[PDB]
């Protein structure tokens, strides 16, 4: 369209996307090679599995060099489409963008395509078809969040009786809503000052207020209040008892844990009656949640080698066990449901979460999501897909940036730590201010303030 900006490109000079494509992608692929080598160390050095692994390693090496060499992105072969169940969308994109190469291609398509090429290598090898080359990293990162994991578990156990009372009914509930929304937002970047308040009394205290203010000072667009209004009004409605909340997930580990905590909080307080979680169907963007990552999380909570909370009788051990158990209970009763869909791992932006997307599940998902009271989109990549990853002016109205999602009947909330060039909905002058501030310690990269992960946005749309 004449006034819709183009998408960020791997050749947009001076952008974080350009840096990502030229510098970060080769590192991620080399890391995968190294993690495959690491896994190899734990198995026999011959046989179909070991040999298949050596071959994947060699292909990953060549793939990394392809990115460095900036070669044209090739279509998936018919064999690859069949054996690895690749969506047909990629090849249609490539037909419409002839001879695009790593050196000059849309950042969004190419990043998604990168993980697809990696996954095809695994799916071809029978002994590796379900192996997650990012699992070692996912697990190591979550392992290192022990202190925060325990603090939140302690908090859940402490709050449980009070949440029940609240469900039986509020201004204290609003404070907790902000906390759980913000912890979900920041994920493993959450400061301990927020987490160390593990009782209602500590959360309401001066200390709690200061922690929330510190967090909120970095949330430059903050529509938390709008989501609060939606759920409280739904809870107060004399008619219709079902309150459905959806999570379009981002990272595994602590972020997924914080999302589960937010869901548990909503369920126990009456702000939700059912939460549905939407995961990726292949290893993706390194850390992104797959269905199996939820099972692994629950197992981790109970694993006293992984989370060494001490003898089973510590407050710490009991709280971890309690939460794992709660997760199993919620899944069995259907209060929490996990789903995966190939749509989330295609190149399609979320302007395709619309009835007009009739080929790759977009219309199917849109129709179902219309039924949600609140669809929460987690993290940066989801925000990129909501906005088309386009070069919008940074003051662009949120409703404009999200295209048909402004008017097609989905009520949405983006919780985005800012980690990419795309940025919209800012107040006049704010970009210049933050850019000047960030320019001090990052000469020539002031505009990268919204790529640093230090700031965040919380953006709401009614879908009407
Ligand atoms: O995990 P998130 O929040 O989706 O962030 C993904 C990060 O990786 C990127 O895809 C760049 O490689 C950006 O979206 C962001 O910097
Ligand atoms: Mg991610």
Task: Annotate the chain with three-state secondary structure.
Answer: CCCCCCECECCCCCCHHHHHHHHHHHHHHHHHHHHHHHHHCCCCCCCHHHHHHHHHHHHHHHHHHHHHHCCECCCCCHHHHHHCCCCCHHHHHHHHCCCCECCECEHHHHHHHHHHHHHHHHHHCCCCCCCCCCHHHHHHHHHCCHHHHHHHHHHHHHHHHHHHHHHHCCHHHHHHHHHHHHHHHHHHHCCHHHHCCCCHHHHHCHHHHHHHHHHHCCEEEECHHHHHHHHHHHHHCCCCCCCEEEEECCECCHHHHHHHHHHHHHHHHCCCCEEEEEEECCCCCCCECEHHHHHHHHHHHHCCCCCCCCCCCCHHHHHHHHHHHHHHHHHHHCCEEEEECHHHHCCCCHHHCCCCCCCCCHHHHHHHHCCCCEEEEEHHHHHHHHHCCECCCCCCCHHHHCHHHHCCCCCEEEEEECCCCCCCCCCCCHHHHHHHHHHCCCCCCHHHHHHCCCCEEEEEECCC
Q: Give φ, ψ of 242 to 5 degrees.
A: -70, 125
Please name the residue whose Cα sits nearest to atom 15 of ligand 1: 419
Q: If you measure from the C-alpha of residue 119 to the centroid of ligand 1, how many angstroms do you get, rounded to a whole number?
A: 18
Distance CA 117, CA 280 (A): 15
Tell how far the Cα of 420 is from the centroid of ligand 1, in angstroms. Answer: 7
Instruction: Report d(CA 258, CA 269) in Å as an integer.
Output: 16
Among 55, 97, 56, smallest CA distance to 74 is for: 97
**In sequence order, what are the residues at sequence separation of 6 or more whose Cβ sits closer than 8 angstroms to the Cβ of residue 367?**
355
Nearest residue to 123 (alpha-carbon basis) of 67, 91, 77, 72: 77
**Å from CA of 381 to ligand 2 middle:** 7
Cα(90)–Cα(254) distance, integer angstroms: 31
| Position in ligand 1 atom list of the atom nearest CA 453 | 16
Between CA 277 and CA 266 the distance in angstroms is 14
456-461 and 412-417 beta bridge pairing: antiparallel
Cβ contacts of 413 within 8 Å, gap of 6 or more: 223, 226, 227, 374, 375, 376, 377, 458, 459, 460
Residue with tokens 């999501």: 369
> From the CB of 380, is ligand 1 less than 6 Å away?
yes
85-91 CB contacts, 8 Å cutoff, 24+ apart: 85/123, 85/342, 86/116, 86/120, 87/342, 87/345, 87/346, 87/360, 88/359, 88/360, 89/346, 89/347, 89/348, 89/359, 89/360, 90/116, 90/346, 90/347
Q: In what order do the strands lie in the sheet with 336-340?
A: 219-222, 456-461, 412-417, 374-378, 244-248, 274-279, 336-340
Centroid of chain to Cα 338: 14
**Closest-CA residue to 408 (of 457, 356, 458, 343):** 356
Name residue 171's beta-bridge partners.
Answer: none
The residue with tokens 């190294």 is 34
The rounded Å distance from CA 251 to ligand 1 centre is 10
Judge contact between 134 and 33, C-beta under 8 A: no
| Dihedral sign of CA atoms 66, 67, 68, 69 in order | positive
Phi first, then psi: give them for residue 457, nearest 5 degrees: -135, 150
Tell me if 17 CB under 6 Å of ligand 1: no
| CB of 381 shorter than 6 A to ligand 1 | yes
Q: Is 20 in the pocket of ligand 1 (CB under 6 A)?
A: yes
Q: Which atom of ligand 1 is nearest to the CA of 384?
A: 14
Radius of gyration over every alpha carbon of the chain, rounded to an integer in angstroms: 22
d(CA 32, CA 97): 28
Ligand 1 within 6 A of 251 CB?
A: yes
Distance (Å, rounded) from C-alpha 53 to C-alpha 324? 34
Distance, CA of 60 to CA of 138 (rounded, Å): 20
Structure tokens at 265: 């909080």
Instruction: Could you list the residues known to form a binding site for substrate, using ranges.
Output: 24, 111, 250-251, 380-384, 419
Q: At what angle do helices 315-333 and 254-269 cross, to 10 degrees?
A: 70
Residue 14 contacts by C-beta under 8 Å, 6 or more apart in sequence?
Answer: 444, 445, 447
Cα angle value 11/16/19 (rounded, 5°): 60
Of all atoms in ligand 1, which is nearest to the CA of residue 416? 3
Q: How far apart are CA 110 and CA 87, in angstroms?
A: 15
Ligand 1 binding pocket mutation candidate from 419, 448, 450 (most atoms within 8 A of CB): 419
Ligand 1 mutation target, pool 108, 137, 285, 388, most atoms within 8 A of CB: 285
- Which among 411, 240, 287, 272 is positioned nearest to 336, based on CA atoms? 272
Name residues whose C-beta falls within 8 Å of residue 373's C-beta, 6 or more positions apart in sequence: 230, 231, 234, 243, 244, 245, 272, 411
Architecture of the domain defined by 12-131: Up-down Bundle (1.20)
Method used to obtain the model? X-ray
Neighbours of 89 (CB within 10 A): 22
Which residues does 271 contact at the CB level (< 8 Å), separation at least 6? 173, 177, 231, 232, 234, 235, 243, 245, 265
Angle between helices 291-302 and 135-143 (to 10 degrees): 40
Please work out whether the CB of residue 285 comes within 6 Å of at least one atom of ligand 1.
yes
Q: Which residues are annotated as a binding site?
A: 24, 111, 250-251, 288, 380-384, 419
Return the closest-CA partner of residue 340 out of 265, 282, 395: 282
Count CA atoms closer than 13 A to 271's CA, side-chain side.
23
Task: Say how many Å lie between the CA of residue 380 and the centre of ligand 2.
Answer: 7
Measured from the Cβ of residue 445, the count of other Cβ atoms closer than 10 Å reads 17
Residue with tokens 């989370």: 307
For ligand 2, a single-atom ion, which residues have Cβ within 5 Å? 250-251, 285, 287-288
Residue ranges per structural domain of the chain: 1-11+132-464, 12-131
In 3D space, the residue among 247, 241, 270 whose CA is nearest the CA of residue 177 turns out to be 270
Are residues 438 and 6 in contact, defined by beta-carbon separation less than 8 angstroms? no
Q: Pick from 130, 127, 131: which is nearest to 47 by CA?
A: 127
How many angstroms separate the CA atoms of 435 and 447, rounded?
A: 5
Distance between CA 16 and CA 66 in Å, rounded? 20
Q: Is 99 left (phi over 0), alpha (psi -120 to 50) or beta?
A: left
Resolution as reported, in Å: 1.8
Beta bridge partners of 232: none
Ligand nearest to the CA of 386: 1
Cβ neighbors of 259 (< 8 A, separation 6 or more) are: 184, 247, 249, 277, 378
Minimal-distance CA residue to ligand 1 atom 5:
380
Burial tier of 69 (Cβ tally within 10 Å: 0-12, 13-18, 19+): exposed
- Which ligand 1 atom lies nearest to the CA of residue 382? 4
What distance separates the 2 farthest-apart alpha carbons in the chain?
66
User: Is the dihedral angle over the CA atoms 250, 7, 348, 284 positive or is it negative?
Assistant: negative
Q: How far apart are CA 400 and CA 51, in angstroms?
A: 51
Alpha-carbon gap, residue 20 to 202, rounded angstroms: 41
């Amino acid at each position: 369209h004449m006034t819709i900006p183009g998408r960020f490109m791997t050749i947009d000079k001076g952008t974080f996307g350009e840096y990502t494509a030229s510098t970060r992608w080769p590192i991620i692929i080399q890391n995968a090679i190294d993690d495959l080598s690491k896994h190899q160390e734990t198995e026999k050095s011959n046989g179909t599995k070991f040999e298949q692994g050596e071959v994947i390693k060699k292909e990953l090496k060549e793939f990394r060099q392809e990115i460095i060499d900036r070669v044209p992105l090739r279509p998936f072969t018919e064999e690859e489409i069949k054996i690895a169940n690749v969506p047909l969308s990629f090849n249609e994109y490539l037909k419409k963008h002839p001879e695009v190469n790593w050196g000059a291609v849309e950042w969004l398509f190419s990043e998604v395509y990168l993980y697809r090429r990696v996954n095809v290598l695994f799916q071809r090898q029978c002994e590796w078809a379900k192996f997650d080359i990012f699992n070692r990293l996912k697990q190591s990162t979550f392992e290192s969040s022990f202190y925060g994991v325990v603090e939140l578990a302690l908090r859940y156990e402490n709050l449980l009786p009070q949440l029940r009372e609240m469900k039986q009914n509020d201004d204290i509930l609003k404070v907790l809503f902000k906390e759980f929304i913000e912890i979900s937002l920041w994920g493993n970047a959450t400061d301990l000052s927020l987490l160390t308040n593990a009782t209602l009394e500590d959360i309401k205290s001066i200390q709690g207020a200061k922690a929330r203010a510190a967090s909120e000072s970095k949330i430059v667009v903050n529509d938390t209040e709008k989501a609060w209004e939606v759920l409280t009004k739904a809870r107060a409605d004399a008619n219709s008892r079902e309150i459905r909340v959806d999570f379009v997930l981002d990272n595994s580990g602590f972020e997924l844990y914080a999302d589960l905590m937010l869901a548990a909080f909503l369920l126990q307080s009456g702000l939700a009656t059912k939460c549905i979680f939407h995961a990726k169907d292949i290893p993706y963007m390194v850390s992104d949640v797959m269905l199996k990552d939820f099972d692994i999380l629950v197992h981790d909570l109970r694993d006293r080698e992984f989370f060494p909370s001490g003898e089973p009788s510590t407050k710490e051990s009991r709280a971890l066990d309690l939460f794992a158990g709660e997760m199993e209970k919620f899944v069995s009763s259907g209060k929490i449901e996990f789903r995966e869909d190939s749509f989330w791992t295609t190149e399609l932006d979320y302007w395709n979460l619309d009835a007009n997307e009739t080929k790759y599940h977009g219309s199917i998902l849109h129709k179902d999501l219309q039924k949600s009271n609140l669809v929460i989109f987690k993290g940066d990549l989801n925000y990129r897909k909501l906005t088309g990853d386009r070069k919008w002016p940074r003051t662009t109205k949120w409703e404009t940036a999200i295209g048909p999602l402004a008017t097609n009947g989905i009520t949405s909330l983006s919780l985005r730590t800012c980690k990419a060039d795309v940025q919209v909905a800012l107040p006049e002058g704010l970009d210049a201010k933050l850019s000047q501030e960030w320019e001090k310690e990052n000469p020539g990269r002031g505009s990268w303030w919204c790529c640093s992960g230090k700031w965040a946005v919380i953006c709401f749309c009614s879908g009407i």
